[PDB]
Design a protein around this nucleic acid. Sequence first.
DNA 1: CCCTAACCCTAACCCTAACCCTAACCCTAACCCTAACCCTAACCCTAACCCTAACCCTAACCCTAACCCTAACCCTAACCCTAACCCTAACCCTAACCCTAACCCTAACCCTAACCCTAACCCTAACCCTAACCCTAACCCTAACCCTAACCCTAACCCTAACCCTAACCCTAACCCTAACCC
DNA 2: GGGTTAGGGTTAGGGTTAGGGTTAGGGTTAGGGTTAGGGTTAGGGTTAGGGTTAGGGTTAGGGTTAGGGTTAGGGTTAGGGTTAGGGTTAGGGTTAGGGTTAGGGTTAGGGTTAGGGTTAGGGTTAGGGTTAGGGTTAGGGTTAGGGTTAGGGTTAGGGTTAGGGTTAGGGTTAGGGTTAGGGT
Lengths: 99, 100, 65, 87, 84, 87
Amino acid sequence: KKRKRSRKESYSVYVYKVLKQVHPDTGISSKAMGIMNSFVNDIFERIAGEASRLAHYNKRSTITSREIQTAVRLLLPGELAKHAVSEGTKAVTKYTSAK
Amino acid sequence: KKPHRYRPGTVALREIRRYQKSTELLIRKLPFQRLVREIAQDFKTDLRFQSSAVMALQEACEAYLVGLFEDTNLCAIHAKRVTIMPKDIQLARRIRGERA
Amino acid sequence: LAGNAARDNKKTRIIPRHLQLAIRNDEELNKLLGRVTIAQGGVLPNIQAVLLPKKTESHHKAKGK
Amino acid sequence: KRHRKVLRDNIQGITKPAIRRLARRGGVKRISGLIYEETRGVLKVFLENVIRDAVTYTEHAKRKTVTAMDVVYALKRQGRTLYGFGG
Amino acid sequence: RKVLRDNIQGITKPAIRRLARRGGVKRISGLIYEETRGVLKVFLENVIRDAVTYTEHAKRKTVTAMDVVYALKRQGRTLYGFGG
Amino acid sequence: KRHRKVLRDNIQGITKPAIRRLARRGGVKRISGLIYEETRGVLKVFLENVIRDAVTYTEHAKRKTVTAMDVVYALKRQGRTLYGFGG
DNA sequence: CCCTAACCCTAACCCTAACCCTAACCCTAACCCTAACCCTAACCCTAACCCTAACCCTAACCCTAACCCTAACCCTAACCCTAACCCTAACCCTAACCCTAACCCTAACCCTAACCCTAACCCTAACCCTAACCCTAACCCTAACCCTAACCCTAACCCTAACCCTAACCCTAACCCTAACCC
DNA sequence: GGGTTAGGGTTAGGGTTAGGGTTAGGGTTAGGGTTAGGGTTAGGGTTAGGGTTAGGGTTAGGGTTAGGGTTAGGGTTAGGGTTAGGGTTAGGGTTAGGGTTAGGGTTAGGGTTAGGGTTAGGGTTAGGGTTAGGGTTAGGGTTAGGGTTAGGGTTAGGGTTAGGGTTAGGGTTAGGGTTAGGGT
C-alpha cells in the first residue's frame, strides 16, 4: 500500500530479461512469475545452506568461492552439475580481471 | 454406440482422458471452506482465515489425494485385479512410511 | 525405559540393543527417532501370521481320506 | 441473526462424485464401493496436521488471522513445498 | 587385485539369505539373488561419492568415519553411534 | 447470534473444591494432586453412557425433549435404580 | 419478566393382524460307514544350572582453563492511536450439479489338476580368519605472515509503483473426420 | 463385414490481461578511505597399510529328490452404464460495518571487557566386580503311524406351515388449548 507502507523485494525484473535472451517475442503471465520467483528464492536457501555447515565442520569462519562449488557439486544432480560448476568459474574469471 | 448404451467401462476411459488434461480444482469451494473451519475450532476459537489460506489448503489436499490413488492403482494391478479397494489403500500407506 | 528392559533380560548394563527395544516399542519415541539407525542394534521380533505353520495337512496329495 | 455454528457434517461434505473425479485423474478405472468412507479418513488426518502447525505459527505472532505465508511455512516442514500461493 | 566380478560376487548367496531371514521372508525365489546385488551397488555408489566430495574440501587423502556419518545424514538416514 | 465461547463447558465446574467436597463425604483424608484430572475422566465416561440410552428412548417416541422418566428408565438398565427423582 | 415452540386430546378413515382350513413340504428320530484325532515310541532341539577366568568399567589421581561475578555500556523490543481496509455479515437469487432408482453385464472368487523348482542333507575343497610381522606416508602443531575483508562515509542511480492500453486470449456458434453400431 | 452415430478444429466479438512507458520518489549501492583478523606457509612426531610371516576352522560350494506352491482354465454375478427432474446448493452478486493491524514513539537487556579467581571437566591411570563359553542336566518341538469312535451322511412318516378363503381395532395425521423451556 502507499500509506507510508513497506516495499517488497522480488527477482521479477531480472527473470524477464533472461526470458528475452533465450526466447525472443515470448511473454510470461503474472501467475507464472509467482512459481518462478519462488524457485529462485528456494535454490538460494539450499545452495547457501550446505555452505554454512561445510564451513563449520572444517572450523573455518568464511563462506568463500570454494564452498559454493562443493555445495553445487552435492545438491544439484548429474549433468546439470558439470554444466553449472563450469559456467560459474567463467564469470568469477571475468570479475577478477575488472570490477 | 447407440447413445442409449456404451458397454461398461468405456465411458470412464473418455473421462480419464478429458480430466488429466485440465487444472480446475475438483472439490467444491463452499463445502471445503467449512471442513477447515470445523477442524480449526479445537486448536483455537476466534481464528479468522484470509481468502488465500483456504485456497492453498485446497491445492495441497487435492495433490496428496491425487497421488495416493496413483500408488493404490499400482498396487491393485499387481494382484491381477483392475479395481481399487479398501485393503489396497493401507498397503500404500505402510510402504510410503506415513502410518508407521 | 531402557533400564527397565535390561532387568527383563537379566543384565545390569544398558548395552546398545536394550536401547532399540525401548525406542522401537514406544508410540511417541518411534515417531521422532523414526529414520535413525542404531549401531550394532537389531530388529524387533515379528513373524506375519499367514506364514506360521498352519497348512493343515496341505492336501492335493493322494486322497488322505 | 446467524444463530447457528458449523456442526461436524462437513467431513461428509466431500460428495461421492468428487472422490470419483479426483480418482479418474489418477488412472483409477472401477472404484469399489467402500473406498468413499476410507478417503474421508485419509483427508481428515491430513487437514488437521497442516492446521495444527499453522495455528502454532500464528499464536507466536499473537495475531488472530491465519495468513497464507503461515500455511506455506507449515507445509514445507511436513514434507511438500507448495510454490506459488505464497511468497 | 580388485577383480570387478569378485568384489560383487563377494556378497555370496548364503549372506543374501541370512540378511533376508532377519526380515521375515520364508521362501526366496532364485532370481532375488541377482537383483539384490544390483541394489547394493547403486546405494554404495551414492554414499561413497558424497564422502569423497567432503574429503576433497579439506584437502585430505583419507575418508574418515565422520564424513560417512555426514554423507548418510543428508540423504535422510542418520546413523547414531559410529561417529559423533 | 452465538455465545462467543463454544466450549460447551469442557468437563468444567468440577473445580478442585467440588472434588475435595465429594471426596471428604467419602472418607478421603489427604487427596493427592493428580486425582483431579482423573476424576474428570471417570465422570466423563459415565455422563455420556446414561445420555446415549436417554436420547435413544426419546427418538423412539419422536419427541424432541428428554423428560426425567427417560433418565430413570435408562439408569435402571445400567444397574442403579434412582428412586423418586422422576418416579 | 417475556415469550415462542413444543405438547396433548380429538376426531375421522383406511390398513392390517387374526382366525380358519385343508394340504402339502420339511425336519425330526433312527441307521450305518468313514475318517479326524489322540496316543506313542522315537529323534532332535532347548533351556537351566552351574563354574570359571579373564577382560574390561569404576574408582582413584592431577592440572588447566573455560566459567564467573562487578564494572560500565547501549541497542532494542517494549506500549498506543490511527488510519484504513478487509473480512464477516444474514442480504440474495438460480440453473447446474447432487441424488436416485431400475438395470444389465463383466469381473471377483472358487475348485481341481498338472508340474516345475525350491528346500533339506551330505561330501569337500578351499578362503578367510586370526597371531600379528614391518615401515612409512599423511596428520597435526607450532611460528609468522601479508593479503583481505570489515567499517564509517557520500554521492548518485537504479528499482518499485500507480497509471494507461491494446493486444493476444478468451466463450460461442456452425460445420467436417472419426470410432461404436457387430457379421 | 455393415453405413453407422460421435465428436473436433475454426472464429467474430467483446472483455480482460498482461505490456508499456513514465515520471517520481525511494532505498540501495558504488565509490572513497583504514586496520585487524585470518588463512597460509614452513618444519617435525606418528598412524593406515601392505605384505608376506604363518597357521587353523567354518563355509560356501555341488548334487539330488520329494514336497509343495503356483498358475493356469472353466462356473457364477458388483460396479459399471442410463435418465432427468427436483431438491438442493454453490455460485454470481450486494452493502456495510465492525474487526484487526501495520504505521508510530521509549527502556529493559544482552553483549562486553578484563584481569583475576577459581572449580569442574578432561585426560590418566591400576585396582576392585567382572561376564559371557562350556560342560552337564533336565524339559520341550517334530516325525510318523494305528486304532478307535465321534461326527457327517442317509430314510420316511409325522409335525408344522404356508397359502388361501375370510373381519374391524389399532394405529395414523392434523388441530386445538396450554405451558414451559430458553432468553434476557
